[PDB]
Amino acid sequence: MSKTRVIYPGTFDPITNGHVDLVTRASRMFDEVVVAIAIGHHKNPLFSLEERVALAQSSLGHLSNVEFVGFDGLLVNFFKEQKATAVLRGLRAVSDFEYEFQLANMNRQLDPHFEAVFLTPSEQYSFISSTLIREIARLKGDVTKFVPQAVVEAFERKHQQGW
Ligand SMILES: O=C1O[C@H]([C@@H](O)CO)C(O)=C1O
Ligand SMILES: O=C1O[C@H]([C@@H](O)CO)C(O)=C1O
């Protein structure tokens, strides 16, 4: 009867209906969920940390047991700092599965308390990824069906400006 705390790390660049499904599913099984948004210094997220957090808070803030935090560094250092029970990840495809298996084993070797649990997407989100959504929006496609409305607007406002 100890409290459970799971971290869902990601770039969330941007958040999609698939991530929303995962976090909702997880919020029913664990006491606390942390949506952990990897800053990506030596990477190049299209959306800033502030935009990514706001887009996440706008789709998931209605769930009382969900928190939103930016992080960088080693996922296992964040894991220790957060006092987490586990990391959560979604597995969409075979390449996801192989990479995630390797990472779980590497993290367990860096921290023996480390744990990773996985969810499988509902089939209505199995074909949605952040990368593909970026590609369609860039080419002026409609992403309304795959992402929350606030993300649709954020793509319009990214066009409107230039950064
Ligand atoms: O959170 C993430 O979003 C995508 C993927 O989860 C979407 O399928 C990605 O590269 C992450 O780290
Ligand atoms: O925040 C929102 O949730 C749905 C979206 O998840 C379905 O694409 C929608 O359109 C919003 O206004």
Side-chain angles (χ1 to χ4, degrees):
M1 42 120 335
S2 206
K3 213 159 148 71
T4 64
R5 188 162 176 85
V6 306
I7 296 165
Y8 185 23
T11 63
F12 301 95
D13 185 39
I15 197 178
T16 76
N17 292 347
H19 299 105
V20 169
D21 199 57
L22 253 45
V23 172
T24 310
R25 287 172 44 203
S27 68
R28 299 183 175 122
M29 290 193 270
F30 302 107
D31 297 314
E32 292 162 346
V33 187
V34 187
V35 174
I37 310 190
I39 290 153
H41 281 122
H42 298 117
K43 312 39 113 31
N44 257 327
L46 181 65
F47 294 100
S48 63
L49 208 223
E50 172 64 17
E51 304 160 335
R52 287 182 283 146
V53 173
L55 294 176
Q57 268 166 345
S58 161
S59 312
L60 291 170
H62 78 270
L63 303 167
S64 50
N65 67 335
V66 179
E67 310 168 29
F68 310 86
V69 342
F71 82 103
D72 56 13
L74 222 37
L75 182 60
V76 282
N77 287 337
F78 183 67
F79 182 92
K80 283 149 158 177
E81 286 155 26
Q82 289 280 326
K83 252 79 77 76
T85 317
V87 171
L88 178 76
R89 317 256 348 67
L91 300 180
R92 279 200 321 95
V94 166
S95 65
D96 269 23
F97 166 71
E98 297 211 285
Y99 177 66
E100 291 300 342
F101 185 129
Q102 169 190 29
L103 262 35
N105 280 328
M106 186 85 254
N107 289 335
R108 234 181 275 102
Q109 292 275 285
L110 297 167
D111 173 17
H113 316 296
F114 181 87
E115 178 71 85
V117 302
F118 304 97
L119 281 49
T120 248
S122 347
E123 68 284 343
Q124 74 252 42
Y125 307 127
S126 62
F127 62 85
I128 307 177
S129 76
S130 293
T131 301
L132 229 208
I133 294 301
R134 286 199 302 273
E135 260 276 75
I136 295 166
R138 204 190 86 212
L139 301 170
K140 321 305 305 196
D142 179 7
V143 303
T144 293
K145 283 180 175 173
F146 319 124
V147 305
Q149 201 48 220
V151 174
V152 186
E153 288 159 17
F155 276 118
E156 287 161 18
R157 302 202 257 259
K158 252 249 147 52
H159 281 317
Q160 271 181 282
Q161 198 170 45
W163 59 270

PDB file of all heavy atoms in Angstrom, residues 17 20 58-59 143-150, ligand 2:
ATOM      1  N   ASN A  17      -3.223  12.484 -30.262  1.00  0.00           N
ATOM      2  CA  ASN A  17      -4.350  11.708 -29.693  1.00  0.00           C
ATOM      3  C   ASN A  17      -3.818  10.387 -29.155  1.00  0.00           C
ATOM      4  O   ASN A  17      -4.354   9.897 -28.202  1.00  0.00           O
ATOM      5  CB  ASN A  17      -5.443  11.508 -30.721  1.00  0.00           C
ATOM      6  CG  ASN A  17      -6.134  12.805 -31.070  1.00  0.00           C
ATOM      7  OD1 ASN A  17      -5.952  13.791 -30.370  1.00  0.00           O
ATOM      8  ND2 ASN A  17      -6.913  12.798 -32.142  1.00  0.00           N
ATOM      9  N   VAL A  20      -2.462  10.979 -25.728  1.00  0.00           N
ATOM     10  CA  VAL A  20      -3.548  11.345 -24.792  1.00  0.00           C
ATOM     11  C   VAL A  20      -4.148  10.032 -24.305  1.00  0.00           C
ATOM     12  O   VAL A  20      -4.425   9.912 -23.088  1.00  0.00           O
ATOM     13  CB  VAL A  20      -4.594  12.271 -25.451  1.00  0.00           C
ATOM     14  CG1 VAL A  20      -5.851  12.430 -24.585  1.00  0.00           C
ATOM     15  CG2 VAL A  20      -3.999  13.633 -25.741  1.00  0.00           C
ATOM     16  N   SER A  58      -3.078  21.484 -21.792  1.00  0.00           N
ATOM     17  CA  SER A  58      -4.408  21.731 -22.399  1.00  0.00           C
ATOM     18  C   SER A  58      -5.151  20.429 -22.725  1.00  0.00           C
ATOM     19  O   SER A  58      -6.383  20.453 -22.625  1.00  0.00           O
ATOM     20  CB  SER A  58      -4.260  22.598 -23.597  1.00  0.00           C
ATOM     21  OG  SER A  58      -5.421  22.459 -24.398  1.00  0.00           O
ATOM     22  N   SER A  59      -4.491  19.333 -23.126  1.00  0.00           N
ATOM     23  CA  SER A  59      -5.214  18.066 -23.460  1.00  0.00           C
ATOM     24  C   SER A  59      -5.392  17.174 -22.225  1.00  0.00           C
ATOM     25  O   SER A  59      -6.304  16.352 -22.218  1.00  0.00           O
ATOM     26  CB  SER A  59      -4.527  17.302 -24.573  1.00  0.00           C
ATOM     27  OG  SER A  59      -4.208  18.168 -25.658  1.00  0.00           O
ATOM     28  N   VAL A 143      -4.470  17.913 -39.791  1.00  0.00           N
ATOM     29  CA  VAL A 143      -4.074  16.948 -38.747  1.00  0.00           C
ATOM     30  C   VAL A 143      -5.131  16.878 -37.658  1.00  0.00           C
ATOM     31  O   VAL A 143      -4.834  16.308 -36.617  1.00  0.00           O
ATOM     32  CB  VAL A 143      -2.680  17.287 -38.227  1.00  0.00           C
ATOM     33  CG1 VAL A 143      -1.694  17.292 -39.370  1.00  0.00           C
ATOM     34  CG2 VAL A 143      -2.622  18.579 -37.436  1.00  0.00           C
ATOM     35  N   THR A 144      -6.321  17.408 -37.923  1.00  0.00           N
ATOM     36  CA  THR A 144      -7.408  17.607 -36.940  1.00  0.00           C
ATOM     37  C   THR A 144      -7.766  16.260 -36.310  1.00  0.00           C
ATOM     38  O   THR A 144      -7.984  16.199 -35.092  1.00  0.00           O
ATOM     39  CB  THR A 144      -8.628  18.262 -37.608  1.00  0.00           C
ATOM     40  OG1 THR A 144      -8.311  19.602 -38.002  1.00  0.00           O
ATOM     41  CG2 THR A 144      -9.806  18.319 -36.670  1.00  0.00           C
ATOM     42  N   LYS A 145      -7.807  15.224 -37.128  1.00  0.00           N
ATOM     43  CA  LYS A 145      -8.246  13.873 -36.698  1.00  0.00           C
ATOM     44  C   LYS A 145      -7.223  13.225 -35.776  1.00  0.00           C
ATOM     45  O   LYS A 145      -7.660  12.393 -35.002  1.00  0.00           O
ATOM     46  CB  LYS A 145      -8.425  12.956 -37.903  1.00  0.00           C
ATOM     47  CG  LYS A 145      -9.698  13.213 -38.681  1.00  0.00           C
ATOM     48  CD  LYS A 145      -9.853  12.301 -39.858  1.00  0.00           C
ATOM     49  CE  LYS A 145     -11.188  12.508 -40.529  1.00  0.00           C
ATOM     50  NZ  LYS A 145     -11.273  11.725 -41.779  1.00  0.00           N
ATOM     51  N   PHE A 146      -5.941  13.617 -35.833  1.00  0.00           N
ATOM     52  CA  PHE A 146      -4.846  12.914 -35.117  1.00  0.00           C
ATOM     53  C   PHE A 146      -4.349  13.605 -33.854  1.00  0.00           C
ATOM     54  O   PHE A 146      -3.500  13.018 -33.150  1.00  0.00           O
ATOM     55  CB  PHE A 146      -3.655  12.761 -36.037  1.00  0.00           C
ATOM     56  CG  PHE A 146      -4.116  12.390 -37.411  1.00  0.00           C
ATOM     57  CD1 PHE A 146      -3.756  13.155 -38.507  1.00  0.00           C
ATOM     58  CD2 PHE A 146      -5.005  11.335 -37.582  1.00  0.00           C
ATOM     59  CE1 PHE A 146      -4.263  12.856 -39.764  1.00  0.00           C
ATOM     60  CE2 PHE A 146      -5.498  11.026 -38.840  1.00  0.00           C
ATOM     61  CZ  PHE A 146      -5.120  11.781 -39.930  1.00  0.00           C
ATOM     62  N   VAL A 147      -4.755  14.847 -33.634  1.00  0.00           N
ATOM     63  CA  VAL A 147      -4.191  15.670 -32.533  1.00  0.00           C
ATOM     64  C   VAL A 147      -5.332  16.478 -31.961  1.00  0.00           C
ATOM     65  O   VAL A 147      -6.288  16.812 -32.660  1.00  0.00           O
ATOM     66  CB  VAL A 147      -3.058  16.612 -33.002  1.00  0.00           C
ATOM     67  CG1 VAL A 147      -1.930  15.885 -33.707  1.00  0.00           C
ATOM     68  CG2 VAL A 147      -3.593  17.707 -33.892  1.00  0.00           C
ATOM     69  N   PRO A 148      -5.221  16.838 -30.684  1.00  0.00           N
ATOM     70  CA  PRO A 148      -6.141  17.801 -30.078  1.00  0.00           C
ATOM     71  C   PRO A 148      -6.179  19.148 -30.832  1.00  0.00           C
ATOM     72  O   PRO A 148      -5.194  19.537 -31.444  1.00  0.00           O
ATOM     73  CB  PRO A 148      -5.555  18.046 -28.692  1.00  0.00           C
ATOM     74  CG  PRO A 148      -4.629  16.863 -28.423  1.00  0.00           C
ATOM     75  CD  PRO A 148      -4.134  16.417 -29.794  1.00  0.00           C
ATOM     76  N   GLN A 149      -7.323  19.821 -30.773  1.00  0.00           N
ATOM     77  CA  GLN A 149      -7.610  21.101 -31.466  1.00  0.00           C
ATOM     78  C   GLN A 149      -6.556  22.165 -31.116  1.00  0.00           C
ATOM     79  O   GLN A 149      -6.063  22.841 -32.031  1.00  0.00           O
ATOM     80  CB  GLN A 149      -9.017  21.605 -31.111  1.00  0.00           C
ATOM     81  CG  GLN A 149      -9.570  22.602 -32.124  1.00  0.00           C
ATOM     82  CD  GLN A 149      -9.432  22.154 -33.567  1.00  0.00           C
ATOM     83  OE1 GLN A 149      -9.113  22.949 -34.447  1.00  0.00           O
ATOM     84  NE2 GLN A 149      -9.666  20.876 -33.835  1.00  0.00           N
ATOM     85  N   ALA A 150      -6.135  22.249 -29.868  1.00  0.00           N
ATOM     86  CA  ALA A 150      -5.092  23.198 -29.486  1.00  0.00           C
ATOM     87  C   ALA A 150      -3.804  22.947 -30.307  1.00  0.00           C
ATOM     88  O   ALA A 150      -3.071  23.900 -30.554  1.00  0.00           O
ATOM     89  CB  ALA A 150      -4.856  23.103 -28.026  1.00  0.00           C
TER      90      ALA A 150
HETATM   91  O1  LIG B   2      -8.721  18.811 -27.170  1.00  0.00           O
HETATM   92  C1  LIG B   2      -9.437  18.247 -28.038  1.00  0.00           C
HETATM   93  O2  LIG B   2      -9.659  16.830 -28.088  1.00  0.00           O
HETATM   94  C2  LIG B   2     -10.174  16.467 -29.372  1.00  0.00           C
HETATM   95  C3  LIG B   2      -9.092  15.663 -30.102  1.00  0.00           C
HETATM   96  O3  LIG B   2      -8.344  14.902 -29.083  1.00  0.00           O
HETATM   97  C4  LIG B   2      -9.632  14.857 -31.316  1.00  0.00           C
HETATM   98  O4  LIG B   2      -8.845  15.082 -32.523  1.00  0.00           O
HETATM   99  C5  LIG B   2     -10.410  17.789 -29.985  1.00  0.00           C
HETATM  100  O5  LIG B   2     -10.721  17.924 -31.262  1.00  0.00           O
HETATM  101  C6  LIG B   2     -10.236  18.745 -29.116  1.00  0.00           C
HETATM  102  O6  LIG B   2     -10.836  19.928 -29.164  1.00  0.00           O
END
